[PDB]
Amino acid sequence: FVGGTSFD
């Protein structure tokens, strides 16, 4: 997901 450390 956009907005975090290495998330989808």
Secondary structure layout plus pairing:
Elements lengths: L8
3D structure, described in words:
The protein has 8 residues and is low in regular secondary structure. The chain has no helices and no strands. The chain is flat and about 10 Å long. The termini are close together. The PDB classes it as de novo protein.
Strand content: under 5%
Radius of gyration: 4 Å
Number of helices: 0
Described by strand count, sense and barrel closure, the largest sheet is: none
| Shape annotation | flat
* Strands, total number: 0
PDB class: de novo protein
Keywords: orbitide, cyclic peptide, plant peptide
Assembly: monomeric
Entry title: PawL-Derived Peptide PLP-12
What key attributes describe this structure?
8 residues, orbitide, little secondary structure, de novo protein, 0% strand
Concise overview:
The protein is largely without helices or strands. Helix content is 0%, strand content 0%.
